[PDB]
Curated annotation (Swiss-Prot), chain A:
Outcome (variant: residue 38 to F): In strain: Omicron/BA.1
Lineage of the species this protein comes from: Viruses, Riboviria, Orthornavirae, Pisuviricota, Pisoniviricetes
Annotated S-S bridges: 89-100, 139-183
Function text: Subunit of the fusion protein that is processed upon entry into the host cell. Mediates fusion of the virion and cellular membranes by functioning as a class I viral fusion protein. Contains a viral fusion peptide that is unmasked after S2 cleavage. This cleavage can occur at the cell membrane by host TMPRSS2 or during endocytosis by host CSTL. In either case, this triggers an extensive and irreversible conformational change that leads to fusion of the viral envelope with the cellular cytoplasmic membrane, releasing viral genomic RNA into the host cell cytoplasm.
Tree of life domain: Viruses
Residues in coiled coil: 6-50
Name of this chain's protein: Spike protein S2'
Glycosylation sites: 131, 155, 191
Amino acid sequence: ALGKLQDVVNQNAQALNTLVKQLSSNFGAISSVLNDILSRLDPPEAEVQIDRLITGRLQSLQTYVTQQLIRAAEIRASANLAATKMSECVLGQSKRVDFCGKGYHLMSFPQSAPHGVVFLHVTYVPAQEKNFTTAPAICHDGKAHFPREGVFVSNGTHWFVTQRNFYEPQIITTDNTFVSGNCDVVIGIVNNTVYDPLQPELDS
Amino acid sequence: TMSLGVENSVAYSNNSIAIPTNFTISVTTEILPVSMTKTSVDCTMYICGDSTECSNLLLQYGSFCTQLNRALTGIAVEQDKNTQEVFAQVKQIYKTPPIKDFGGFNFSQILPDPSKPSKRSFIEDLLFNKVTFNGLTVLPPLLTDEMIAQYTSALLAGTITSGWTFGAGAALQIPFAMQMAYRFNGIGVTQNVLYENQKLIANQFNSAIGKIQDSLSLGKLQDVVNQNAQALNTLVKQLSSNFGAISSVLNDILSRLDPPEAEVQIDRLITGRLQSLQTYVTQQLIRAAEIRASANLAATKMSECVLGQSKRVDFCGKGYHLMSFPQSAPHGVVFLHVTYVPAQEKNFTTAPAICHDGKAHFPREGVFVSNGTHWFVTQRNFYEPQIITTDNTFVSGNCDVVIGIVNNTVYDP
Amino acid sequence: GTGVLTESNKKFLPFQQFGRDIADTTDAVRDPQTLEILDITPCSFGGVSVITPGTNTSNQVAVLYQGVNCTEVNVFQTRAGCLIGAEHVNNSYECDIPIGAGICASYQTQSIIAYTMSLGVENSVAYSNNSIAIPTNFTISVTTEILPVSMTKTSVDCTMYICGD
Ligand SMILES: *[C@@H]1O[C@H](CO)[C@@H](O[C@@H]2O[C@H](CO)[C@@H](O)[C@H](O)[C@H]2NC(C)=O)[C@H](O)[C@H]1NC(C)=O
Ligand SMILES: *[C@@H]1O[C@H](CO)[C@@H](O[C@@H]2O[C@H](CO)[C@@H](O)[C@H](O)[C@H]2NC(C)=O)[C@H](O)[C@H]1NC(C)=O
Ligand SMILES: *[C@@H]1O[C@H](CO)[C@@H](O[C@@H]2O[C@H](CO)[C@@H](O)[C@H](O)[C@H]2NC(C)=O)[C@H](O)[C@H]1NC(C)=O
Ligand SMILES: *[C@@H]1O[C@H](CO)[C@@H](O[C@@H]2O[C@H](CO)[C@@H](O)[C@H](O)[C@H]2NC(C)=O)[C@H](O)[C@H]1NC(C)=O
Ligand SMILES: *[C@@H]1O[C@H](CO)[C@@H](O[C@@H]2O[C@H](CO)[C@@H](O)[C@H](O)[C@H]2NC(C)=O)[C@H](O)[C@H]1NC(C)=O
Ligand SMILES: *[C@@H]1O[C@H](CO)[C@@H](O)[C@H](O)[C@H]1NC(C)=O
Ligand SMILES: *[C@@H]1O[C@H](CO)[C@@H](O)[C@H](O)[C@H]1NC(C)=O
Ligand SMILES: *[C@@H]1O[C@H](CO)[C@@H](O)[C@H](O)[C@H]1NC(C)=O
Ligand SMILES: *[C@@H]1O[C@H](CO)[C@@H](O)[C@H](O)[C@H]1NC(C)=O
Ligand SMILES: *[C@@H]1O[C@H](CO)[C@@H](O)[C@H](O)[C@H]1NC(C)=O
Ligand SMILES: *[C@@H]1O[C@H](CO)[C@@H](O)[C@H](O)[C@H]1NC(C)=O
Ligand SMILES: *[C@@H]1O[C@H](CO)[C@@H](O)[C@H](O)[C@H]1NC(C)=O
């Protein structure tokens, strides 16, 4: 579960261990211990070997520092991404798909972790589906009616208007649909009746 | 001196608003690198090829060879991961339905062609045709181009038959005309615009696909390929340098000097070649970091541009983004972003509110525009004037407070 | 040199002798005893990769000689290289131990097998111009996303590291 953070810690430890171990390499010198070089050889001779050791160790240090700089750049990119998620995922809700966990994001909770941050993304995922017949619009009195919100469905006998992300059929009314054009334009319009809430009040 | 573009001046005034009366569906092609060549160099063979004495002398320097082999291997594994993140975002390999009655939209150019030896779509074929042994080897990518093609076709089939739903949960079939109605709702243009003009939109989209095909018929990807090839060729060529040694060829030095003497020459060559190798590895690490940023951007676009819809401006094409279609390409991904761009604007006189009986009415959605004699309320991204009524406007406050309120009548249904 | 000596299909011009390659390596040497324009090819080389399931599960392993013909080395040929010790199975599964070129290995019924990864199950969508699937229920799921943020604030006293007092 913690692969990403454990890999970071292991990489840093490996870098340090390699750097320390480099001290023992001869690098072409008679020995990897500086005092042994000083004692065994004369100063004029010892200078060459010590210079070779210094060259080797400086190259090793430079390699370590370059690796550290690159890895720190990668971690900075990760930290910028984490800060962006903290801002757009915890302190708010995000419309960005798959930015804040699979599904339609609801919220997040941050948690600290050694050298990292762990988000718990709470998301809403549709579960069960039913096949319905649908048509873009409904013509009632020669004028097309389109849903204000959600889509039209049919259970095989009657037409209803339901919100897009959750089945909750309701009677089609002039308060749920708006009129635009006539039946002669829309492709796939279907014939039905749109109930008028106002009519019964005036009839009685 | 460069022009910086054409000059323009907007006819701005405190009571003038331009409303678009027509629209164009434009498909733009955005190309992104995703992965690079998986190189691998054996430091021992590159530096001291087949020379036991040279290998022994190199051993002194310690773990330089090991950590170079670790860094290059890390780059290779990261490249495989980049491909995985960018493409393998669909749980289930969908396939397009046998009957392609997508509301008149013709996708045949982007969908796979079964007749080809590799199930790639026409655009993928054009893209593929567009882009073109001493210790160095190339490790083949984990996913062959055929599997990349399968993944892109699955993403595309889901985007066509299920919209964004397959991004959230199980792919929910939905007629393509209604899917575009949803997307038009997303950009703010009421859905009736789509149905009332489905044929025009379909023709515009098909023409856009044809134009993209003609345009393709790839600078960024070729740039990556050329840069990696250049780095490899430089690394290979460095082997010919003397670095102060009598001769670049190690074997000649071996048969030229006694072991004690040849030691100095071999040390000079080893330092030179090791420095060159370190330089190459650092350059590769940095360029691979750049490619990881590019591949992460590509994954983000795939997620928020294909599987969904973007409200982010200019992140997904230039315009009111409608949708996207992925396509593979050698070491990269090409997006066809379908966007809704208004055009054929017209000047109208505007006003922030309208007073009927001392009550100030404001539009629920859309703005008030007059053709000079009458006032109407119209959606902001299209010209659909409608009579001003209590249903289209909500009351608030009174006439005095607002600035620029004009007098009119609000019809009562 | 050490290589495979093979008569060159390319022929040196009568003056041409002892050519080199772009890499500066000896591409071909004209036959000294009897001019034959002999070419040199580096002997096959590659990387050995030990594909092994966790030792706790089993100690059985397979070997991948990368980018070498199986002849040069139960051997299975893959674009990645030659795979020795692994059984080739037509059935596809989810990639477990990636090998390359679409080939993945795993440990299953028990031995090590190599195969082509499936990429996931096939699911055709029942699309049609008047059919829609609208969810009737939902689920609230909590997923974990782990991000590195900082790395150890190391520092090195270069003078003391290089020189031991
Ligand atoms: C929906 O109803 C309308 C009328 O309410 C139908 O329109 C009829 O179409 C036929 C065939 O052209 C004409 O002969 C009739 O005169 C039309 N009716 C009217 C009132 O003009 C339409 O066909 C119906 N569609 C469906 C799918 O049931
Ligand atoms: C909106 O613009 C489109 C094209 O930008 C118009 O469609 C063109 O209409 C002309 C008629 O003036 C035809 O000659 C072209 O063949 C049409 N092109 C296409 C691609 O269909 C459309 O008429 C415009 N609509 C309005 C209301 O102005
Ligand atoms: C979708 O577009 C393709 C090409 O853009 C159409 O295929 C062409 O079909 C015509 C006959 O209808 C042939 O004469 C051409 O040679 C075909 N071209 C290619 C490249 O195959 C296809 O018919 C279109 N389909 C729809 C439904 O519009
Ligand atoms: C502004 O729009 C109104 C609304 O249609 C126009 O008034 C109509 O004009 C047409 C002729 O163009 C007449 O047939 C209608 O009887 C008019 N109806 C009403 C309610 O006035 C008006 O002409 C338009 N003015 C301009 C300058 O475009
Ligand atoms: C809009 O109409 C209102 C009344 O319907 C106008 O208010 C009048 O303002 C004048 C100038 O101060 C007063 O003398 C009147 O008594 C006001 N009318 C009423 C009913 O009190 C207002 O001026 C009109 N505005 C415009 C721009 O035409
Ligand atoms: C809808 O009908 C198709 C017909 O092939 C079927 O496969 C599918 O399972 C149905 N919907 C659901 C939710 O099962
Ligand atoms: C849907 O397509 C079928 C053919 O597959 C056709 O008979 C029917 O009229 C179409 N209906 C609509 C609304 O497009
Ligand atoms: C609006 O008026 C300005 C006045 O300069 C004119 O330039 C512009 O073309 C007009 N708008 C349209 C859509 O014609
Ligand atoms: C707009 O500005 C003009 C002056 O440029 C002024 O006469 C007019 O009253 C202003 N109208 C509104 C609604 O602000
Ligand atoms: C390997 O060698 C065999 C015969 O020795 C040959 O048939 C085959 O094509 C070779 N394959 C490769 C990849 O070199
Ligand atoms: C896979 O099936 C083919 C026939 O399609 C057969 O020739 C081959 O031997 C099978 N694989 C194995 C490992 O037997
Ligand atoms: C919805 O699903 C939950 C479990 O996921 C279940 O307890 C509940 O009864 C379901 N609701 C309906 C109406 O089936």
